[PDB]
mmCIF file of all heavy atoms in Angstrom:
data_model
loop_
_atom_site.group_PDB
_atom_site.id
_atom_site.type_symbol
_atom_site.label_atom_id
_atom_site.label_comp_id
_atom_site.label_asym_id
_atom_site.label_seq_id
_atom_site.Cartn_x
_atom_site.Cartn_y
_atom_site.Cartn_z
ATOM 1 N N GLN D 1 9.282 -2.710 2.813
ATOM 2 C CA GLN D 1 8.701 -3.203 4.082
ATOM 3 C C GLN D 1 7.780 -2.140 4.663
ATOM 4 O O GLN D 1 6.691 -2.446 5.141
ATOM 5 C CB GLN D 1 9.821 -3.475 5.116
ATOM 6 C CG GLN D 1 9.284 -4.099 6.358
ATOM 7 C CD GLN D 1 9.663 -5.524 6.275
ATOM 8 O OE1 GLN D 1 9.061 -6.297 5.506
ATOM 9 N NE2 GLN D 1 10.725 -5.866 6.996
ATOM 10 N N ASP D 2 8.219 -0.852 4.649
ATOM 11 C CA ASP D 2 7.367 0.221 5.192
ATOM 12 C C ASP D 2 6.042 0.275 4.446
ATOM 13 O O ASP D 2 5.003 0.485 5.070
ATOM 14 C CB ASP D 2 8.034 1.564 5.001
ATOM 15 C CG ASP D 2 9.138 1.933 5.916
ATOM 16 O OD1 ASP D 2 9.403 1.162 6.850
ATOM 17 O OD2 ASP D 2 9.765 3.026 5.685
ATOM 18 N N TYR D 3 6.079 0.069 3.119
ATOM 19 C CA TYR D 3 4.828 0.142 2.335
ATOM 20 C C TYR D 3 3.909 -1.017 2.709
ATOM 21 O O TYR D 3 2.689 -0.816 2.877
ATOM 22 C CB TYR D 3 5.058 0.247 0.813
ATOM 23 C CG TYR D 3 3.755 0.484 0.093
ATOM 24 C CD1 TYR D 3 3.044 1.667 0.271
ATOM 25 C CD2 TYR D 3 3.197 -0.492 -0.724
ATOM 26 C CE1 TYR D 3 1.794 1.851 -0.306
ATOM 27 C CE2 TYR D 3 1.932 -0.321 -1.302
ATOM 28 C CZ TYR D 3 1.238 0.856 -1.090
ATOM 29 O OH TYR D 3 -0.009 1.083 -1.671
ATOM 30 N N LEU D 4 4.489 -2.242 2.886
ATOM 31 C CA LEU D 4 3.604 -3.359 3.303
ATOM 32 C C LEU D 4 3.043 -3.122 4.678
ATOM 33 O O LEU D 4 1.886 -3.463 4.915
ATOM 34 C CB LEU D 4 4.292 -4.742 3.175
ATOM 35 C CG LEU D 4 4.646 -5.098 1.710
ATOM 36 C CD1 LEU D 4 5.011 -6.542 1.598
ATOM 37 C CD2 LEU D 4 3.457 -4.853 0.748
ATOM 38 N N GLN D 5 3.829 -2.545 5.614
ATOM 39 C CA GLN D 5 3.282 -2.269 6.959
ATOM 40 C C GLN D 5 2.176 -1.216 6.902
ATOM 41 O O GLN D 5 1.210 -1.271 7.680
ATOM 42 C CB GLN D 5 4.365 -1.882 7.965
ATOM 43 C CG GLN D 5 5.339 -3.027 8.175
ATOM 44 C CD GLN D 5 6.574 -2.655 8.960
ATOM 45 O OE1 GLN D 5 7.130 -1.570 8.845
ATOM 46 N NE2 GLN D 5 7.046 -3.572 9.780
ATOM 47 N N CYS D 6 2.306 -0.245 5.969
ATOM 48 C CA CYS D 6 1.264 0.762 5.755
ATOM 49 C C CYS D 6 -0.055 0.049 5.295
ATOM 50 O O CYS D 6 -1.145 0.232 5.885
ATOM 51 C CB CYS D 6 1.764 1.731 4.684
ATOM 52 S SG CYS D 6 0.494 2.876 4.080
ATOM 53 N N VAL D 7 0.047 -0.796 4.253
ATOM 54 C CA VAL D 7 -1.147 -1.470 3.719
ATOM 55 C C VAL D 7 -1.775 -2.375 4.763
ATOM 56 O O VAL D 7 -2.996 -2.434 4.916
ATOM 57 C CB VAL D 7 -0.747 -2.274 2.472
ATOM 58 C CG1 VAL D 7 -1.892 -3.137 1.976
ATOM 59 C CG2 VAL D 7 -0.276 -1.341 1.354
ATOM 60 N N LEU D 8 -0.930 -3.072 5.531
ATOM 61 C CA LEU D 8 -1.432 -3.997 6.554
ATOM 62 C C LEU D 8 -1.892 -3.324 7.866
ATOM 63 O O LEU D 8 -2.271 -4.023 8.838
ATOM 64 C CB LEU D 8 -0.331 -5.012 6.856
ATOM 65 C CG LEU D 8 -0.053 -6.008 5.785
ATOM 66 C CD1 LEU D 8 1.133 -6.897 6.213
ATOM 67 C CD2 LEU D 8 -1.313 -6.872 5.541
ATOM 68 N N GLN D 9 -1.750 -1.963 7.925
ATOM 69 C CA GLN D 9 -2.112 -1.142 9.077
ATOM 70 C C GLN D 9 -1.348 -1.510 10.339
ATOM 71 O O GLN D 9 -1.879 -1.446 11.469
ATOM 72 C CB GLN D 9 -3.632 -1.135 9.303
ATOM 73 C CG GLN D 9 -4.359 -0.508 8.116
ATOM 74 C CD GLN D 9 -5.595 0.213 8.536
ATOM 75 O OE1 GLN D 9 -5.543 1.339 9.046
ATOM 76 N NE2 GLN D 9 -6.740 -0.429 8.362
ATOM 77 N N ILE D 10 -0.082 -1.838 10.157
ATOM 78 C CA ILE D 10 0.819 -2.165 11.262
ATOM 79 C C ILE D 10 2.137 -1.377 11.170
ATOM 80 O O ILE D 10 3.230 -1.975 11.224
ATOM 81 C CB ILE D 10 1.085 -3.679 11.346
ATOM 82 C CG1 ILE D 10 1.580 -4.227 9.986
ATOM 83 C CG2 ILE D 10 -0.177 -4.420 11.825
ATOM 84 C CD1 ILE D 10 2.322 -5.550 10.059
ATOM 85 N N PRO D 11 2.089 -0.027 11.061
ATOM 86 C CA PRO D 11 3.343 0.740 11.047
ATOM 87 C C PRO D 11 4.183 0.425 12.283
ATOM 88 O O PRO D 11 3.634 0.244 13.391
ATOM 89 C CB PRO D 11 2.863 2.206 11.120
ATOM 90 C CG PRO D 11 1.446 2.134 11.680
ATOM 91 C CD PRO D 11 0.923 0.876 11.031
ATOM 92 N N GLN D 12 5.496 0.350 12.097
ATOM 93 C CA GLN D 12 6.410 0.055 13.186
ATOM 94 C C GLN D 12 6.348 1.152 14.235
ATOM 95 O O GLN D 12 6.554 2.326 13.914
ATOM 96 C CB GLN D 12 7.849 -0.034 12.646
ATOM 97 C CG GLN D 12 8.899 -0.383 13.714
ATOM 98 C CD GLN D 12 8.752 -1.799 14.257
ATOM 99 O OE1 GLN D 12 8.893 -2.047 15.460
ATOM 100 N NE2 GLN D 12 8.483 -2.764 13.386
ATOM 101 N N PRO D 13 6.060 0.805 15.499
ATOM 102 C CA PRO D 13 6.084 1.837 16.549
ATOM 103 C C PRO D 13 7.518 2.381 16.672
ATOM 104 O O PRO D 13 8.473 1.636 16.428
ATOM 105 C CB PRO D 13 5.656 1.070 17.819
ATOM 106 C CG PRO D 13 5.153 -0.273 17.343
ATOM 107 C CD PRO D 13 5.822 -0.546 16.049
ATOM 108 N N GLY D 14 7.663 3.669 16.967
ATOM 109 C CA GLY D 14 8.987 4.268 17.078
ATOM 110 C C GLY D 14 9.072 5.635 16.431
ATOM 111 O O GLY D 14 8.087 6.375 16.435
ATOM 112 N N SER D 15 10.242 5.984 15.870
ATOM 113 C CA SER D 15 10.410 7.311 15.263
ATOM 114 C C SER D 15 9.671 7.477 13.920
ATOM 115 O O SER D 15 9.542 8.612 13.441
ATOM 116 C CB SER D 15 11.886 7.696 15.146
ATOM 117 O OG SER D 15 12.511 7.196 13.975
ATOM 118 N N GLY D 16 9.174 6.375 13.354
ATOM 119 C CA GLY D 16 8.385 6.396 12.128
ATOM 120 C C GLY D 16 9.159 6.376 10.827
ATOM 121 O O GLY D 16 10.389 6.445 10.812
ATOM 122 N N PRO D 17 8.420 6.297 9.704
ATOM 123 C CA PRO D 17 9.078 6.237 8.396
ATOM 124 C C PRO D 17 9.797 7.519 8.001
ATOM 125 O O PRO D 17 9.494 8.598 8.528
ATOM 126 C CB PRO D 17 7.919 5.928 7.431
ATOM 127 C CG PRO D 17 6.666 6.375 8.150
ATOM 128 C CD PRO D 17 6.951 6.153 9.603
ATOM 129 N N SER D 18 10.704 7.428 7.020
ATOM 130 C CA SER D 18 11.441 8.608 6.540
ATOM 131 C C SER D 18 10.539 9.505 5.673
ATOM 132 O O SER D 18 9.459 9.074 5.253
ATOM 133 C CB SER D 18 12.621 8.156 5.675
ATOM 134 O OG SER D 18 12.150 7.506 4.498
ATOM 135 N N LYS D 19 11.032 10.690 5.292
ATOM 136 C CA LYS D 19 10.301 11.573 4.375
ATOM 137 C C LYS D 19 10.041 10.852 3.043
ATOM 138 O O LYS D 19 8.947 10.895 2.525
ATOM 139 C CB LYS D 19 11.154 12.820 4.081
ATOM 140 C CG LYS D 19 10.445 13.802 3.155
ATOM 141 C CD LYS D 19 11.403 14.904 2.696
ATOM 142 C CE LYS D 19 10.680 15.868 1.792
ATOM 143 N NZ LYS D 19 11.469 17.111 1.544
ATOM 144 N N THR D 20 11.051 10.126 2.528
ATOM 145 C CA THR D 20 10.910 9.401 1.259
ATOM 146 C C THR D 20 9.817 8.359 1.398
ATOM 147 O O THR D 20 8.934 8.277 0.537
ATOM 148 C CB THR D 20 12.242 8.721 0.867
ATOM 149 O OG1 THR D 20 13.211 9.736 0.609
ATOM 150 C CG2 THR D 20 12.082 7.809 -0.330
ATOM 151 N N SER D 21 9.843 7.590 2.496
ATOM 152 C CA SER D 21 8.868 6.532 2.667
ATOM 153 C C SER D 21 7.446 7.136 2.802
ATOM 154 O O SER D 21 6.482 6.618 2.239
ATOM 155 C CB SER D 21 9.208 5.739 3.929
ATOM 156 O OG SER D 21 8.421 4.585 3.878
ATOM 157 N N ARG D 22 7.317 8.252 3.532
ATOM 158 C CA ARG D 22 6.005 8.877 3.711
ATOM 159 C C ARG D 22 5.461 9.365 2.338
ATOM 160 O O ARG D 22 4.250 9.217 2.044
ATOM 161 C CB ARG D 22 6.128 9.997 4.738
ATOM 162 C CG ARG D 22 6.294 9.488 6.178
ATOM 163 C CD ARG D 22 6.873 10.598 7.045
ATOM 164 N NE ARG D 22 6.947 10.230 8.464
ATOM 165 C CZ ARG D 22 5.922 10.312 9.316
ATOM 166 N NH1 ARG D 22 4.741 10.782 8.908
ATOM 167 N NH2 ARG D 22 6.078 9.968 10.589
ATOM 168 N N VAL D 23 6.340 9.944 1.494
ATOM 169 C CA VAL D 23 5.875 10.399 0.181
ATOM 170 C C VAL D 23 5.458 9.206 -0.684
ATOM 171 O O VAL D 23 4.403 9.227 -1.317
ATOM 172 C CB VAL D 23 6.947 11.282 -0.486
ATOM 173 C CG1 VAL D 23 6.628 11.516 -1.961
ATOM 174 C CG2 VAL D 23 7.087 12.581 0.293
ATOM 175 N N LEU D 24 6.247 8.132 -0.653
ATOM 176 C CA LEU D 24 5.955 6.965 -1.466
ATOM 177 C C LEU D 24 4.658 6.316 -1.006
ATOM 178 O O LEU D 24 3.857 5.922 -1.834
ATOM 179 C CB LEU D 24 7.140 5.988 -1.291
ATOM 180 C CG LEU D 24 7.018 4.623 -2.007
ATOM 181 C CD1 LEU D 24 6.757 4.796 -3.521
ATOM 182 C CD2 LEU D 24 8.309 3.844 -1.805
ATOM 183 N N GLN D 25 4.418 6.229 0.331
ATOM 184 C CA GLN D 25 3.177 5.566 0.814
ATOM 185 C C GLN D 25 1.921 6.238 0.255
ATOM 186 O O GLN D 25 0.952 5.591 -0.160
ATOM 187 C CB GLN D 25 3.164 5.551 2.352
ATOM 188 C CG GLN D 25 4.233 4.545 2.890
ATOM 189 C CD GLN D 25 4.390 4.625 4.396
ATOM 190 O OE1 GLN D 25 3.410 4.737 5.138
ATOM 191 N NE2 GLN D 25 5.626 4.549 4.885
ATOM 192 N N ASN D 26 1.943 7.551 0.258
ATOM 193 C CA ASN D 26 0.848 8.342 -0.240
ATOM 194 C C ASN D 26 0.607 8.105 -1.747
ATOM 195 O O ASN D 26 -0.532 7.826 -2.149
ATOM 196 C CB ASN D 26 1.186 9.825 0.079
ATOM 197 C CG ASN D 26 0.266 10.827 -0.552
ATOM 198 O OD1 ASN D 26 -0.936 10.785 -0.348
ATOM 199 N ND2 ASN D 26 0.844 11.714 -1.357
ATOM 200 N N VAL D 27 1.643 8.245 -2.569
ATOM 201 C CA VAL D 27 1.499 8.086 -4.032
ATOM 202 C C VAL D 27 1.205 6.644 -4.437
ATOM 203 O O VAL D 27 0.350 6.403 -5.298
ATOM 204 C CB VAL D 27 2.743 8.621 -4.758
ATOM 205 C CG1 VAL D 27 2.568 8.526 -6.268
ATOM 206 C CG2 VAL D 27 3.054 10.048 -4.320
ATOM 207 N N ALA D 28 1.911 5.693 -3.827
ATOM 208 C CA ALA D 28 1.690 4.280 -4.183
ATOM 209 C C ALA D 28 0.303 3.826 -3.769
ATOM 210 O O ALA D 28 -0.305 3.076 -4.520
ATOM 211 C CB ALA D 28 2.751 3.402 -3.536
ATOM 212 N N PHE D 29 -0.238 4.310 -2.625
ATOM 213 C CA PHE D 29 -1.589 3.900 -2.213
ATOM 214 C C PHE D 29 -2.619 4.418 -3.219
ATOM 215 O O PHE D 29 -3.570 3.702 -3.594
ATOM 216 C CB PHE D 29 -1.917 4.367 -0.801
ATOM 217 C CG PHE D 29 -3.243 3.812 -0.350
ATOM 218 C CD1 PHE D 29 -3.438 2.446 -0.261
ATOM 219 C CD2 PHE D 29 -4.336 4.642 -0.180
ATOM 220 C CE1 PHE D 29 -4.681 1.933 0.093
ATOM 221 C CE2 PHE D 29 -5.563 4.129 0.215
ATOM 222 C CZ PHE D 29 -5.731 2.776 0.321
ATOM 223 N N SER D 30 -2.441 5.662 -3.695
ATOM 224 C CA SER D 30 -3.393 6.223 -4.673
ATOM 225 C C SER D 30 -3.423 5.360 -5.938
ATOM 226 O O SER D 30 -4.494 5.077 -6.479
ATOM 227 C CB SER D 30 -2.996 7.661 -5.053
ATOM 228 O OG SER D 30 -3.855 8.151 -6.082
ATOM 229 N N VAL D 31 -2.235 4.919 -6.386
ATOM 230 C CA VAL D 31 -2.118 4.085 -7.585
ATOM 231 C C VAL D 31 -2.730 2.708 -7.278
ATOM 232 O O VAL D 31 -3.482 2.172 -8.087
ATOM 233 C CB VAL D 31 -0.640 3.972 -8.020
ATOM 234 C CG1 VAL D 31 -0.428 2.856 -9.054
ATOM 235 C CG2 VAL D 31 -0.135 5.308 -8.566
ATOM 236 N N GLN D 32 -2.440 2.155 -6.086
ATOM 237 C CA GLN D 32 -2.958 0.823 -5.722
ATOM 238 C C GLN D 32 -4.487 0.787 -5.759
ATOM 239 O O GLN D 32 -5.087 -0.145 -6.292
ATOM 240 C CB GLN D 32 -2.431 0.434 -4.347
ATOM 241 C CG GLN D 32 -2.946 -0.949 -3.952
ATOM 242 C CD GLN D 32 -2.433 -1.443 -2.636
ATOM 243 O OE1 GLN D 32 -1.371 -1.046 -2.126
ATOM 244 N NE2 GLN D 32 -3.252 -2.307 -2.023
ATOM 245 N N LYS D 33 -5.142 1.838 -5.226
ATOM 246 C CA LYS D 33 -6.610 1.884 -5.236
ATOM 247 C C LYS D 33 -7.163 1.843 -6.647
ATOM 248 O O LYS D 33 -8.171 1.165 -6.898
ATOM 249 C CB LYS D 33 -7.114 3.159 -4.554
ATOM 250 C CG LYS D 33 -6.948 3.145 -3.050
ATOM 251 C CD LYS D 33 -7.727 4.356 -2.464
ATOM 252 C CE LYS D 33 -7.104 5.679 -2.881
ATOM 253 N NZ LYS D 33 -7.794 6.857 -2.293
ATOM 254 N N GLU D 34 -6.507 2.551 -7.577
ATOM 255 C CA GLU D 34 -6.976 2.597 -8.965
ATOM 256 C C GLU D 34 -6.765 1.238 -9.626
ATOM 257 O O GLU D 34 -7.656 0.738 -10.319
ATOM 258 C CB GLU D 34 -6.247 3.744 -9.717
ATOM 259 C CG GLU D 34 -6.672 3.952 -11.167
ATOM 260 C CD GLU D 34 -8.142 4.188 -11.452
ATOM 261 O OE1 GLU D 34 -8.885 4.579 -10.523
ATOM 262 O OE2 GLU D 34 -8.550 3.991 -12.622
ATOM 263 N N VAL D 35 -5.608 0.616 -9.394
ATOM 264 C CA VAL D 35 -5.308 -0.700 -9.990
ATOM 265 C C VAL D 35 -6.279 -1.758 -9.440
ATOM 266 O O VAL D 35 -6.822 -2.526 -10.226
ATOM 267 C CB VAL D 35 -3.845 -1.096 -9.726
ATOM 268 C CG1 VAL D 35 -3.581 -2.525 -10.180
ATOM 269 C CG2 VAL D 35 -2.892 -0.123 -10.410
ATOM 270 N N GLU D 36 -6.570 -1.763 -8.103
ATOM 271 C CA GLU D 36 -7.572 -2.704 -7.566
ATOM 272 C C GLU D 36 -8.927 -2.542 -8.225
ATOM 273 O O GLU D 36 -9.582 -3.542 -8.533
ATOM 274 C CB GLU D 36 -7.749 -2.522 -6.049
ATOM 275 C CG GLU D 36 -6.511 -2.923 -5.262
ATOM 276 C CD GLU D 36 -6.636 -2.668 -3.767
ATOM 277 O OE1 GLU D 36 -7.739 -2.296 -3.304
ATOM 278 O OE2 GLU D 36 -5.616 -2.806 -3.062
ATOM 279 N N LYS D 37 -9.371 -1.289 -8.438
ATOM 280 C CA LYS D 37 -10.643 -1.054 -9.107
ATOM 281 C C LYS D 37 -10.575 -1.566 -10.564
ATOM 282 O O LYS D 37 -11.456 -2.303 -11.001
ATOM 283 C CB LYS D 37 -10.991 0.443 -9.045
ATOM 284 C CG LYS D 37 -12.374 0.790 -9.581
ATOM 285 C CD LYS D 37 -12.707 2.247 -9.277
ATOM 286 N N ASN D 38 -9.511 -1.238 -11.295
ATOM 287 C CA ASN D 38 -9.382 -1.642 -12.710
ATOM 288 C C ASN D 38 -9.270 -3.142 -12.888
ATOM 289 O O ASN D 38 -9.692 -3.684 -13.916
ATOM 290 C CB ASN D 38 -8.156 -0.990 -13.335
ATOM 291 C CG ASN D 38 -8.235 0.505 -13.409
ATOM 292 O OD1 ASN D 38 -9.301 1.098 -13.298
ATOM 293 N ND2 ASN D 38 -7.095 1.153 -13.590
ATOM 294 N N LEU D 39 -8.635 -3.811 -11.927
ATOM 295 C CA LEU D 39 -8.389 -5.254 -11.965
ATOM 296 C C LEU D 39 -9.366 -6.062 -11.113
ATOM 297 O O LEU D 39 -9.045 -7.193 -10.771
ATOM 298 C CB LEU D 39 -6.970 -5.547 -11.444
ATOM 299 C CG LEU D 39 -5.760 -4.987 -12.182
ATOM 300 C CD1 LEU D 39 -4.483 -5.658 -11.683
ATOM 301 C CD2 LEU D 39 -5.841 -5.225 -13.650
ATOM 302 N N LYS D 40 -10.505 -5.502 -10.721
ATOM 303 C CA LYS D 40 -11.444 -6.178 -9.811
ATOM 304 C C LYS D 40 -11.780 -7.639 -10.189
ATOM 305 O O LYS D 40 -11.573 -8.543 -9.364
ATOM 306 C CB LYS D 40 -12.733 -5.338 -9.638
ATOM 307 C CG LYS D 40 -13.775 -5.973 -8.727
ATOM 308 N N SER D 41 -12.260 -7.886 -11.418
ATOM 309 C CA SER D 41 -12.600 -9.255 -11.838
ATOM 310 C C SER D 41 -11.401 -10.201 -11.748
ATOM 311 O O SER D 41 -11.525 -11.296 -11.179
ATOM 312 C CB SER D 41 -13.176 -9.256 -13.249
ATOM 313 O OG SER D 41 -13.278 -10.580 -13.747
ATOM 314 N N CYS D 42 -10.229 -9.753 -12.267
ATOM 315 C CA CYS D 42 -8.969 -10.503 -12.237
ATOM 316 C C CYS D 42 -8.619 -10.895 -10.790
ATOM 317 O O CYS D 42 -8.319 -12.058 -10.518
ATOM 318 C CB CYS D 42 -7.839 -9.689 -12.880
ATOM 319 S SG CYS D 42 -6.168 -10.337 -12.546
ATOM 320 N N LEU D 43 -8.633 -9.921 -9.885
ATOM 321 C CA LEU D 43 -8.269 -10.106 -8.497
ATOM 322 C C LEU D 43 -9.225 -10.988 -7.716
ATOM 323 O O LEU D 43 -8.806 -11.638 -6.761
ATOM 324 C CB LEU D 43 -8.093 -8.744 -7.822
ATOM 325 C CG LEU D 43 -6.972 -7.899 -8.414
ATOM 326 C CD1 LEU D 43 -6.956 -6.503 -7.798
ATOM 327 C CD2 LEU D 43 -5.607 -8.591 -8.255
ATOM 328 N N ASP D 44 -10.496 -11.025 -8.116
ATOM 329 C CA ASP D 44 -11.481 -11.871 -7.448
ATOM 330 C C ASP D 44 -11.286 -13.361 -7.752
ATOM 331 O O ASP D 44 -11.771 -14.189 -6.986
ATOM 332 C CB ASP D 44 -12.916 -11.437 -7.784
ATOM 333 C CG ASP D 44 -13.356 -10.139 -7.129
ATOM 334 O OD1 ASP D 44 -12.705 -9.716 -6.149
ATOM 335 O OD2 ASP D 44 -14.351 -9.548 -7.597
ATOM 336 N N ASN D 45 -10.581 -13.714 -8.841
ATOM 337 C CA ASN D 45 -10.362 -15.123 -9.182
ATOM 338 C C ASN D 45 -8.906 -15.588 -9.017
ATOM 339 O O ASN D 45 -8.546 -16.639 -9.539
ATOM 340 C CB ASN D 45 -10.871 -15.432 -10.588
ATOM 341 N N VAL D 46 -8.063 -14.802 -8.320
ATOM 342 C CA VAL D 46 -6.683 -15.200 -8.090
ATOM 343 C C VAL D 46 -6.557 -15.845 -6.674
ATOM 344 O O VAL D 46 -7.285 -15.472 -5.754
ATOM 345 C CB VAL D 46 -5.717 -14.003 -8.310
ATOM 346 C CG1 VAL D 46 -5.592 -13.137 -7.064
ATOM 347 C CG2 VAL D 46 -4.349 -14.478 -8.789
ATOM 348 N N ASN D 47 -5.671 -16.829 -6.526
ATOM 349 C CA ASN D 47 -5.453 -17.473 -5.237
ATOM 350 C C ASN D 47 -3.991 -17.323 -4.849
ATOM 351 O O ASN D 47 -3.167 -18.159 -5.208
ATOM 352 C CB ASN D 47 -5.788 -18.953 -5.298
ATOM 353 C CG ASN D 47 -7.211 -19.306 -5.615
ATOM 354 O OD1 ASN D 47 -7.468 -20.219 -6.419
ATOM 355 N ND2 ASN D 47 -8.154 -18.650 -4.962
ATOM 356 N N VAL D 48 -3.685 -16.311 -4.060
ATOM 357 C CA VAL D 48 -2.322 -16.062 -3.611
ATOM 358 C C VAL D 48 -2.111 -16.858 -2.347
ATOM 359 O O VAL D 48 -2.285 -16.333 -1.238
ATOM 360 C CB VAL D 48 -2.075 -14.548 -3.405
ATOM 361 C CG1 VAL D 48 -0.605 -14.287 -3.155
ATOM 362 C CG2 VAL D 48 -2.567 -13.739 -4.609
#
């Protein structure tokens, strides 16, 4: 849930995410950017 709130730019107001969640957001976002670039054509024709 914390990762989806990060991507959607709606972090929960309050004490914030844990150390684990903060580390994961950083690494998973870097991977997500690369996968979006690699899968650009695929992603442009999908209907979620």
Side-chain angles (χ1 to χ4, degrees), residues 1-36 38-39 41-44 46-48:
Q1 186 104 285
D2 283 355
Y3 187 66
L4 296 193
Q5 297 170 323
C6 170
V7 173
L8 289 177
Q9 297 213 78
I10 53 160
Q12 182 67 221
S15 85
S18 65
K19 181 190 180 168
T20 295
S21 192
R22 287 161 175 278
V23 168
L24 177 55
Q25 289 172 42
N26 171 57
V27 183
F29 186 61
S30 175
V31 166
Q32 180 178 336
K33 287 190 293 182
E34 182 56 20
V35 173
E36 293 176 7
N38 296 342
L39 298 193
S41 169
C42 166
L43 297 174
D44 288 342
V46 85
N47 298 137
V48 189

